[PDB]
Design a protein around this nucleic acid. Sequence first.
RNA 1: UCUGAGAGUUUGAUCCUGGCUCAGGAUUAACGCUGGCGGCAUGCCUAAUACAUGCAAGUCGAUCGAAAGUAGUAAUACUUUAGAGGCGAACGGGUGAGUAACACGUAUCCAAUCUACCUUAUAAUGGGGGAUAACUAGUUGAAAGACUAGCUAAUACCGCAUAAGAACUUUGGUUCGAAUCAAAGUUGAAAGGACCUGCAAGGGUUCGUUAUUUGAUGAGGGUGCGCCAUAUCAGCUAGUUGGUGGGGUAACGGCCUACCAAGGCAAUGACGUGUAGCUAUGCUGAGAAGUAGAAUAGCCACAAUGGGACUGAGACACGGCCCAUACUCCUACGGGAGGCAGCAGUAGGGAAUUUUUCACAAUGAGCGAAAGCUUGAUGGAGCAAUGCCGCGUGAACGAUGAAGGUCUUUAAGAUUGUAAAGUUCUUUUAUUUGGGAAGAAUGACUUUAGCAGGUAAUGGCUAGAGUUUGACUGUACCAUUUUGAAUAAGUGACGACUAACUAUGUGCCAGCAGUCGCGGUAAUACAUAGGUCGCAAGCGUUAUCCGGAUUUAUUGGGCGUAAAGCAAGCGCAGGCGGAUUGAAAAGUCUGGUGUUAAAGGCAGCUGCUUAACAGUUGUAUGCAUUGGAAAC
Lengths: 203, 77, 67, 87
Amino acid sequence: MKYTGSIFKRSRRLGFSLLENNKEFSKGKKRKTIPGQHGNRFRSSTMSGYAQQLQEKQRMQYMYGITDKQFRRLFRLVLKQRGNLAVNLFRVLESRLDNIVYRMGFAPTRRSARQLVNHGHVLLNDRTVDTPSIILNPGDKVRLKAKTIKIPIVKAASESGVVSPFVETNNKTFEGTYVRFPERSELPAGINESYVVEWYKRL
Amino acid sequence: NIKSNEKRLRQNIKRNLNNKGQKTKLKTNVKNFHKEINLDNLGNVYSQADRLARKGIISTNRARRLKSRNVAVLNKT
Amino acid sequence: TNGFEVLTYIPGEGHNLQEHSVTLLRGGRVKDLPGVRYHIVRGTLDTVGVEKRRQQRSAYGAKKPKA
Amino acid sequence: MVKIRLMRMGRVHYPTYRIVAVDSRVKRDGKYIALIGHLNPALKENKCKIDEAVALEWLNKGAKPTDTVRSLFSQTGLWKKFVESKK
RNA sequence: UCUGAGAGUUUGAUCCUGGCUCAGGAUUAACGCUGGCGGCAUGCCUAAUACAUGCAAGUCGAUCGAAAGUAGUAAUACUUUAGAGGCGAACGGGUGAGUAACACGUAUCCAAUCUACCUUAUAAUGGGGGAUAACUAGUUGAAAGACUAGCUAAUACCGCAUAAGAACUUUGGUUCGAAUCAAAGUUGAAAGGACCUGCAAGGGUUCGUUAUUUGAUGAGGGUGCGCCAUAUCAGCUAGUUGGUGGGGUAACGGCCUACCAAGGCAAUGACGUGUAGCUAUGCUGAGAAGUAGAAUAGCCACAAUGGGACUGAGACACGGCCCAUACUCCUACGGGAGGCAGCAGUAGGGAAUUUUUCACAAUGAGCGAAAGCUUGAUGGAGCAAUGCCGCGUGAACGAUGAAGGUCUUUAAGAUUGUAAAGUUCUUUUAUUUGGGAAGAAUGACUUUAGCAGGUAAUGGCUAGAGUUUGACUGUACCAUUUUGAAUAAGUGACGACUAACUAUGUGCCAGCAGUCGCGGUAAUACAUAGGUCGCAAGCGUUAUCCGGAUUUAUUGGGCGUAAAGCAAGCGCAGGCGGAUUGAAAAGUCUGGUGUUAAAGGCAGCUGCUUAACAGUUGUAUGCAUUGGAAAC
């Protein structure tokens, strides 16, 4: 399946906010213990390299909404080119169309943004899209199709949106652009991408 | 069986008979040249070979080889 | 299906061996039984899978129970 | 007779022909002697570039074009550089 | 400039030797469970087992006569060819039984070859003869037919005339057996159809014929090197070895033949055994390379089995012929017919591998001047989760936290859990409407307009014009098109290796297990429940290949006590071997040339909404030959 059941449990065990900072921000007296009946005390007793490496892997791919095989394909494709490993891999993961829609701030959550992308609400470079795995390059222009703006969920995000310097947008015209590659310190750093990148000896 | 094979079965038989008739007269002329040797007989042999050399009954290289081996025995003198 | 004769261990809770019942075979070693080196695919032509099976439901040939 | 024919090298629904200098007694998409450009008869507007180097040699030492090859030999001007150099 | 991960397991405990197993990928996979869509690829590996059934290469009247039919009073004109004749049938499809060898890869020479349609260019396309299909009549059988006698025309056959040059020999001289010249002798060549013109005479155009001169092309022959195991295979071979004369063959040749001699191959593995289509490549590996020869492509072999040969230029012919063998089928007992390893399909086997599906729309092939015809090649559609990739099963808000479940042990609470209930939003897909491609910016077709070889005209070339040609297919796709969260999740594990833990039951019993090992009344290993995590339209198990495995150690292992130095000696062959000087130069090194098919691999790029995928360009490697060098 490409969709997950519960999202706060993921942040519970992974210990990483799937949201910006509100994943465990005392929502209904939010907690940080591991889920299930056995959250009492499993603090750190079998912390192995393999365990924590799986931890960073799931952290890396849960906040992106990906699954295993396509992530493996992404890793292979980014390994095909020349450069540094982790930062190029993160660039490819930030070249996802739905992730760029989220960074546009046009939708409150990546799930809503992904549904809007799939349902044809998103038009890219004067071309409609239906594949959330398109690879965006620097200097690529985006719009909101100039259609289906009459959505209560898209508005309050559209006016209230964090314009990161690596992608610029125009609120009223609903136009965006992928100008420069996001930097390591620009995005959340609760993910140690190194343990992920050398967790793959697959090739 | 397909129609366009037994038609060829008819055509081949008559030319088979004709070519056999030509081959045997080539052969008897060649025997005539062995039993007696002269320019006239072997000239008939050359002409008779060239008759088939026009067509594909005898291979042309066979015709030239045989007439060469006949001029070879002409060269006894 | 050829001329070979082999010992074979049954899986699961109970079985349906019927003394000249046509079966189907499966590899796999068993440490407890020397000589025996095979298992029956349970859920096959004749040997009916063990009922009242709900954990992993693939071995012992049990279909998905009605919810 | 060595014939200049078409070779459907491509996925389903997308023919993409490399023009081929192949003998008559050879099946489709088989081995050949020399290569003659290629073709994508779905993209229009001069998506049909040809080498023009060894094709004229083939025509000058025996070659037989086909109707779809007649088309390509027409626009590029092979005829006006072939039938006059023939004389 | 490329790149090298480990771990568990013998012990009371340790180090080492050492074997097993796991952590990674891959499949022509299958089985259990579950299963929504899209795109791409692939789909008997067992029985080269036997097949019900339907279709798979035919074409041509501008070749012939004649037949049938239509308009016509007739003359005549038109449509089809049963047959004769031209080409095609030898390509294209399928399979890998056989074959361990010039079969294949690869480099070569054929002073040893040939090659129709295709290509440069030349001479002529004259005149006769004799025949036969069909038809008729008869015999004869239900028919298949067969046979008997007459009739015909041709681009069917056969003589005759002259051969530009050929073909072969005769003679003379040329060059480093080849090739060319000169003269002589012998010898062989057609076919005409359609059309224009021409009162005619005759001239010409298109299609056709033979002989010629280059080629392209294809096939064949030979050699180098490489291309399995086996000595629990020591001799093998008598056309075998070599020569002579002849024949034969596209050509060389014991290939055969008449004569002579006994030779030849063999430890560097002959002969034999079993195995197997070879190669590119796929999977793995960093690599040396291990491994299967999937789809596909080059080469090879085969067509129920075994032989033979015609014809054809090309077959010893997959749906040609004869014969024999075995099997089957039909019948009017008189006789016949067949060879699904072509596309579908059936039977059997197997665990297992699909529609008795459409169209020449495109490529193509074949014929036909041309219309056009055939194509189960091909292009398409159906099926299959078999594999790779993409998309869905919603989304935002929503709590001291609904209910139930489990635990806590109950009367606190926690898990489930923003998960839910609920309020709102959208519709790829679900389901309507309308529009609706590209593929067919091709081509044939002939009027036009011109050019150009040659004329009186005719025909090609170049540009346009048009009607034109879609199974795919109202197809994908597009269009604020209708409605609607509605139309979509399972799967394996939870003791460690290796992320994931509690309760109930069972109590050496049922059972689990890749390894260690779990349970004889508190089991985190058995069965279930709850919960958790690993993948997910696939997940697991089994089977096979490589890796880890340096566990065959060339790179890259050891032989005292762990497996391993023969009991010792004499020693042929072989392997290795002091110093110095010269030469040659096999190895060795480097320079040039040729060659090493495409696809695939690598990299870039292009185009698919993007990967899956399709395409472009570049990219190695080895060998032969040639110029050098001269340490070893």
